[PDB]
Amino acid sequence: EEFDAIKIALASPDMIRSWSFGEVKKPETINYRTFKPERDGLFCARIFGPVKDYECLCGKYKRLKHRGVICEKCGVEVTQTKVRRERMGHIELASPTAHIWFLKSLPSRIGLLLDMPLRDIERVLYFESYVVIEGGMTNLERQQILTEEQYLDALEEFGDEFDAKMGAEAIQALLKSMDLEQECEQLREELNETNSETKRKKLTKRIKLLEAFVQSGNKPEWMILTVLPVLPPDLRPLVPLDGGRFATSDLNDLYRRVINRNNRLKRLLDLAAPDIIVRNEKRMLQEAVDALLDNGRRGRAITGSNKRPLKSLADMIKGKQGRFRQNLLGKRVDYSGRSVITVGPYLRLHQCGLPKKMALELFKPFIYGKLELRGLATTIKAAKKMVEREEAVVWDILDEVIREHPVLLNRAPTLHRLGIQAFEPVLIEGKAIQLHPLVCAAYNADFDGDQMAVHVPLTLEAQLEARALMMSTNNILSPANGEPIIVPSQDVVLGLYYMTRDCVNAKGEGMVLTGPKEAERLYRSGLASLHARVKVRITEYEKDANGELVAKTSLKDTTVGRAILWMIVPKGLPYSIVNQALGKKAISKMLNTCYRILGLKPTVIFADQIMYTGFAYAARSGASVGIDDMVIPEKKHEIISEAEAEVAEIQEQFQSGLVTAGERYNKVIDIWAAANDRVSKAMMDNLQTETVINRDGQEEKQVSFNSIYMMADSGARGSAAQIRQLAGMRGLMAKPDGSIIETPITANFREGLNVLQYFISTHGARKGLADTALKTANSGYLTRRLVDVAQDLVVTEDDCGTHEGIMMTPVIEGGDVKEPLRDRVLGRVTAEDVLKPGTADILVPRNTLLHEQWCDLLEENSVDAVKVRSVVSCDTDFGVCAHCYGRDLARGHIINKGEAIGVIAAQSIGEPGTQLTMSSIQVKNKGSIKLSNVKSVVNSSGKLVITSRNTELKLIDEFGRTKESYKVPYGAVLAKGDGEQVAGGETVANWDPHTMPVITEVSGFVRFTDMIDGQTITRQTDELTGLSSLVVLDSAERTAGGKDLRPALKIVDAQGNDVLIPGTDMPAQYFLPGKAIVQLEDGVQISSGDTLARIPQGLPRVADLFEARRPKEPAILAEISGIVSFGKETKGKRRLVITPVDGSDPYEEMIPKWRQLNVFEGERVERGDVISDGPEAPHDILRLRGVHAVTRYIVNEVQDVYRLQGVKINDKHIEVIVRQMLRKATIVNAGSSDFLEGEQVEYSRVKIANRELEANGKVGATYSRDLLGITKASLATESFISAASFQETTRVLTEAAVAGKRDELRGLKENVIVGRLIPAGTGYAYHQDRMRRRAAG
């Protein structure tokens, strides 16, 4: 059974002879009545195998008198059966027809090789035209076609000395002719003669195919078919029904088809026919062959009276339908069940409701071994009898089994690892499954018609894995984030809120206690308010000492509920957290503190009791909500009538003809939305704090009595919006156009809709519901591809010993903190020794576990940037160190080796995305200012204007760690400088948001030069004032006499010089493009910072982000440093005379100068400098930049796309896939292997870690680095099976077979479907044992 590895190869014809057991000879299979396998038909037992045990068909030989005695009459075997699923027969062909996958698919693999067009070959092989097999004379040429009538000319001319026919006979011969080596060295040679691009790749391609067939030993003629297999019946069967009614597979037709044709082939070939009919017949034959391999590929498909196509061989492997997605990776299962579900409010964690019959029938052989053991049922018939007899012992016995026997809970759709769980059983006299409701929060579940399925851990390994791993006590948090996932959902929160509550109103105010026990006695006597601030004593505890509690006690004036509640609490805490109304965030962080400080089990049991007591005292608390709890203000009709007599104002204004519709439209919607806001405010002030209840005073007001606000305040359900909809107007409404409706709503559901209001309400409701009905498809699709990528990846090592990686800095930008660098760091590990703003206060020796003491120790410090050993900077071949990962979150400690990772980010990222699709600069407060990468100038105002676009503004605090950050345009206007302090709330900046300043930093005279009216420009003197200058037109409008002549008004002095750029000899004048219109004439002068001219003006996103999708509109960049001028005059595109300082100028590229430029025709750039405006592509970044910049860009982008929706995942996950996109680097140099070819950057690093070592100073090659689209990145894989499972399969398989390749089962997907154990986690140890066995022989 056990085997090491797999392999693909090309099956020789004699390979099939070896495989086969007998040749097939007829289309028949059986009798009409004796439903019997016929000899030499389909189901001939003689070749495929027998039905029964030792029974020849005529019964001649029998019962082992004649053991190995093939019954000569029927030619039928005697021996054992079960090979009608194994044995494949065969057929010998008359003549050769071709395989198709190596023909039809893209690059053709067969004529691809031959350097011949396809259609030529079609004309051969649709039997239309002859063609040179071989020019016996070189008068004519191999690979030369002859029409069957021009062939006559070639023929009757000579007749003899040429080889030219039409068929595979013509072609196998050609293959049988052609010699590989010479061709290979020839292409190698004459590449170096002319290795231009398309030429070179083509030569390389053919050399590859050559040396592949060389070293493989696979062969060209094996494309073509002279013997054909035939399958065992049981894969292609035929059966009857109870009605005597029969049922077959498609394929038995097609096999049958060919037989007769081949028969009518050979039958005819006895009979000396014209070739034409033979051609026709062969066409029929190879057509049937195609139909076998693919019904509907080459042409119009083939059907029975179904009118539907017959299923291909290929279709069995295909879509989901084949083995992969239907039957192999997803499976039906024994020992599982399902049912409708319900709640156990009483239950604890490990427990689960169980209708008992389920476990009963599911735990049968336990019981049968157990009854044989007792011998009440001595054996198993009686056991089942007694089962039917329903003896009480059974149930005891059943209980006696069921103890400590864990079990599996299953809901779908399973979006992350927490959507299933592992509990302990509990039995019940019902058929509805009771459970611990909170974990609906995990399952996103609800008791509204949901139902679930169940599985068993039979084996002890599974039993214990369950009890240890997806035991819930081992799983309480996300790995996405450090989030308690068992938030008290909806009711416990509210009853508790109501409890911990500080009226003044009820009674018993200002008295004193010993402790909450008498508090119970006192309220419960009916003396008191459970919500009333009154004095008591507490005795709280603290582990200030060496993890060692430190007792103390004192009094508090607190509500009674809170006193009572302290009794639950496990003695390691202050009162301050429980000192308030406890919104559910407080609960979150509160339980958080509990495991922060004590750990799990206190928080666990604590939480269970909190659930319990929430039920208890909420069911006490008294509650309902009704028509009068829903309340309307009075200040609604009047705001209504007021704005109503203003919409009529602008109505009559438009009647007079003043305003537009869009003006009218926007302003009307503005006033209606404002009226909505005012209504909301009125009801809020009229419901929030309206109640007037006296209490030892005249009047007093506190938390409401409406019953509605604190539903939102608890976080149980709802918010101001829904309540507004019930009470006030429920915003506006839209038809699915995307437009916005004009007349909003007035009534509510307390008042009642109009016909029309509900009519209209219809629309967007339907729309967004349709959207809700379809975003899951894209969701599953995407997440599926995500796992499809990163299956390989698991930890291998403790420490990769690697050199530094990433840097972390907070993401605060444009507002306040968005990611505290604290929050970035925690649980990461340093790249590097790391000191403090107290300099040299190192605290890591290049790596420590960056737990929250370190993070607090930091957050003290003003430090604002630090490095971390990156998953990318990790260098473990075929996995990682745990250090570059750090911590498992929902563990809550350092990640141990062996657990796979890519799947984790996939569930992290895919699951939530279901839910996800749905002038001036003004300083805020005071603070330090930090602008750099700066050229600027004291403008003509005396203030500051940018002269290097790089720069942007920040408000740094007085310390040195940032507050705010905002873009700043080139040459925009300021009221301030850098390295200063400024008051808050102060417009520091300004600019025309239309202008892109053409400001002259120089000071120099103006004279009309280089520019003449109607050659390079127009002259358009402003009709109104009179001042103007030479007026530059666009690219097109100017006249062609100076349209090739760059217009440039020139800066001079009184002499006429070039006012050179201040600090550099470079002249200063502007090759003015369109819209750079100057206002003042010849002889005039400008200032420093003086415009001569002005320049007047979601889901699929992220799908593109990760896909490696790429734009069309780049804000194109500086390839190389140094000066540039512009190029050729727009034969579709202008070009660009680049000129490095010390490099080489000639690079220059087609530019649509239709779109605006950044640098001008005489202006210098550094490399890495945008040139046009628009989006840009990632490949440009890698191709030019480093990496950190890149990855940092994209993570910022897409994290914003998340956080937009209020979404929370750690960045670590997203690092991971990056390294899986980067599995290939293209070579630069040569000397090791082929020149440029993309190959494992890993193995590049191997070979150079051997070869460019003193193996050689250098033989090999330097190398680029590359990027791939994600699906094709998945395809580009050492293994093919993961590549073969899902998409573009056929092609992968062919390409796999041509080289006779093989695989080693290292990705988990590989080892799954064979039934082996995982190469990780549990089976990590086993499979590394096997690994060292492969190392140890």
Partner 1 sequence: RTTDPVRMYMREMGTVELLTREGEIDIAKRIEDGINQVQCSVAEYPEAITYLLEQYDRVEAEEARLSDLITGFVDPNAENSIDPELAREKFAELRAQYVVTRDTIKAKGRSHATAQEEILKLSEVFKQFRLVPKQFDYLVNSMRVMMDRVRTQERLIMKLCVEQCKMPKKNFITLFTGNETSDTWFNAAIAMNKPWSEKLHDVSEEVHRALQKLQQIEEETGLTIEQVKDINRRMSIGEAKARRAKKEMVEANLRLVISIAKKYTNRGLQFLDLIQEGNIGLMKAVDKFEYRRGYKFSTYATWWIRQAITRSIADQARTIRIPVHMIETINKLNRISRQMLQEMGREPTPEELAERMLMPEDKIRKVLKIAKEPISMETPIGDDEDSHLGDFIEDTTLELPLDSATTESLRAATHDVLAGLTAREAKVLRMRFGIDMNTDYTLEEVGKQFDVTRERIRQIEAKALRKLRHPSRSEVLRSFLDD
Cα torsion 721, 725, 731, 737 to 10°: value is 100
Does residue 30 interact with partner 1 by CB under 8 A?
A: yes
Residue 383 phi, psi dihedral angles, 5° rounding: -60, -45
Stretch that binds Zn ion, among 45-53, 80-88, 309-317, 799-807 (CB under 5 A): 799-807
The footprint of partner 1 on residues 225-254 (CB under 8 A) is 238-239, 244-250, 252-253
Stretch that binds partner 1, among 29-37, 421-429, 820-828, 1022-1030 (CB under 8 A): 29-37
Among 439, 874, 973, 1273, binds Zn ion (CB under 5 A): 874
Binding residues for Zn(2+) are 56, 58, 71, 74, 800, 874, 881, 884
CA distance 549 to 540: 10
Among 39, 99, 311, 763, binds partner 1 (CB under 8 A): 311
Stretch that binds Mg ion, among 188-196, 241-249, 439-447, 775-783 (CB under 5 A): 439-447
**In the chain, what is the greatest distance between 2 CA atoms, to the nearest angstrom?**
129
CA distances from 748 to 724, 725, 752, 753 (A): 9, 7, 5, 6
Stretch that binds Zn ion, among 665-673, 874-882, 1257-1265, 1299-1307 (CB under 5 A): 874-882
Count CB-CB contacts under 10 A for residue 1167.
14
Residue 271 touches which of Mg ion, Zn ion, partner 1, none (CB < 5 to 8 A by kind)? partner 1
CA distance 560 to 523: 9
For residue 210, the cross-strand partners are none
Residue 800 touches which of partner 1, Mg ion, Zn ion, none (CB < 5 to 8 A by kind)? Zn ion
CA distance 219 to 10: 8
| 8 Å CB contact between 998 and 980 | no
Total site size for Mg ion, rule CB under 5 A: 2
CA distances from 100 to 97, 106, 257, 291 (A): 10, 11, 19, 10
CB of 477 to Mg ion, least distance (A): 24
Residue 450 touches which of partner 1, Zn ion, Mg ion, none (CB < 5 to 8 A by kind)? Mg ion
Nearer to Mg ion, 270 or 446 (CB): 446
Residue 520 touches which of Zn ion, Mg ion, partner 1, none (CB < 5 to 8 A by kind)? none
The footprint of partner 1 on residues 348-387 (CB under 8 A) is 379-382
Nearer to partner 1, 29 or 873 (CB): 29
CA distance 1226 to 1276: 14
Does residue 821 interact with Zn ion by CB under 5 A?
A: no
CB of 117 to partner 1, least distance (A): 13
Residue 580 touches which of partner 1, Zn ion, Mg ion, none (CB < 5 to 8 A by kind)? none
Stretch that binds Mg ion, among 313-321, 449-457, 483-491, 814-822 (CB under 5 A): 449-457
Nearer to partner 1, 252 or 995 (CB): 252
Does residue 446 interact with Mg ion by CB under 5 A?
A: yes
Does residue 260 interact with partner 1 by CB under 8 A?
A: yes
The footprint of partner 1 on residues 267-296 (CB under 8 A) is 268, 271-272, 274, 276-277, 280-281, 283-284, 287
CB of 321 to partner 1, least distance (A): 10
CA distances from 1185 to 1105, 1167, 1190 (A): 19, 9, 8
Nearer to partner 1, 271 or 983 (CB): 271
Does residue 66 interact with Zn ion by CB under 5 A?
A: no
Among 58, 94, 842, 1255, binds Zn ion (CB under 5 A): 58
Does residue 256 interact with partner 1 by CB under 8 A?
A: yes
Residue 248 touches which of partner 1, Mg ion, Zn ion, none (CB < 5 to 8 A by kind)? partner 1
The footprint of Zn ion on residues 884-903 (CB under 5 A) is 884
Q: Is 597 exposed, middle or buried (0-12, 13-18, 19+ CB in 10 A)?
A: middle
Residue 32 touches which of partner 1, Mg ion, Zn ion, none (CB < 5 to 8 A by kind)? partner 1
Stretch that binds partner 1, among 258-266, 412-420, 630-638, 1027-1035 (CB under 8 A): 258-266
CA distance 110 to 222: 11
Nearer to Zn ion, 36 or 60 (CB): 60
Nearer to partner 1, 239 or 755 (CB): 239
Residue 71 touches which of Mg ion, Zn ion, partner 1, none (CB < 5 to 8 A by kind)? Zn ion
Does residue 389 interact with partner 1 by CB under 8 A?
A: no
∠ CA 1169-1172-1176, rounded to 5°: 75
Nearer to Zn ion, 831 or 944 (CB): 831
Where are the strands (E) in 1120-1266, listed by range? 1124-1126, 1136-1138
Residue 998 touches which of partner 1, Mg ion, Zn ion, none (CB < 5 to 8 A by kind)? none
Tell me the CB-side half-sphere exposure of residue 580, using CA atoms within 13 A.
12
Residue 57 touches which of Zn ion, partner 1, Mg ion, none (CB < 5 to 8 A by kind)? Zn ion
∠ CA 1026-1032-1036, rounded to 5°: 135
Residue 1266 touches which of partner 1, Zn ion, Mg ion, none (CB < 5 to 8 A by kind)? none
CB of 202 to partner 1, least distance (A): 25
Does residue 450 interact with Mg ion by CB under 5 A?
A: yes
Task: Assign 3-class secondary structure to 1181-1207.
Answer: HHHHCCCHHHHHHHHHHHHHHHHHCCC
Stretch that binds Mg ion, among 446-454, 471-479, 793-801, 848-856 (CB under 5 A): 446-454
CB of 412 to Mg ion, least distance (A): 11
∠ CA 603-607-610, rounded to 5°: 140
DSSP string for 752-813: ---HHHHHHHHHHHHHHHHHHHSSHHHHHHHHHHHHHHHTT-BEEES---PPP-EEE----T
What own/partner pairs with CB < 8 Å and gap ≥ 24 does 930-939 have?
930/954, 930/956, 930/962, 930/978, 931/968, 931/978, 932/978, 934/978, 937/1001, 937/1088, 937/1089, 938/1088, 938/1089, 939/973, 939/974, 939/1088, 939/1089
Nearer to Mg ion, 218 or 490 (CB): 490
H or E stretch covering 151? helix 150-157
Residue 1239 touches which of Zn ion, partner 1, Mg ion, none (CB < 5 to 8 A by kind)? none
Nearer to partner 1, 412 or 511 (CB): 412
Chain-centroid distance of CA 387 in Å reads 52
Stretch that binds Mg ion, among 389-397, 438-446, 559-567, 1281-1289 (CB under 5 A): 438-446
CA distance 310 to 1008: 81
Residue nearest to Mg ion (CB): 450
∠ CA 429-432-435, rounded to 5°: 100
Nearer to Zn ion, 60 or 87 (CB): 60
Contacts of 1301 (CB under 8 A, 6+ apart): 7, 8, 1280
| 8 Å CB contact between 207 and 213 | no
Chain-centroid distance of CA 1071 in Å reads 47
∠ CA 795-797-799, rounded to 5°: 120
CA distance 1009 to 1046: 11
Q: Please report, in angstroms and rounded to a whole number, the separation of the first and last CA atoms in the chain.
A: 19
Eight-state DSSP code of residue 1006: E
Among 99, 264, 537, 1185, binds partner 1 (CB under 8 A): 264
Residue 380 touches which of Zn ion, Mg ion, partner 1, none (CB < 5 to 8 A by kind)? partner 1
Eight-state DSSP code of residue 830: B
The encoded tokens of residue 423 equal 């509990």
Site residues, partner 1 (CB under 8 A): 27-30, 32, 64, 122, 126, 128, 238-239, 244-250, 252-253, 256, 260-261, 264, 268, 271-272, 274, 276-277, 280-281, 283-284, 287, 298-300, 304, 306, 311, 379-382
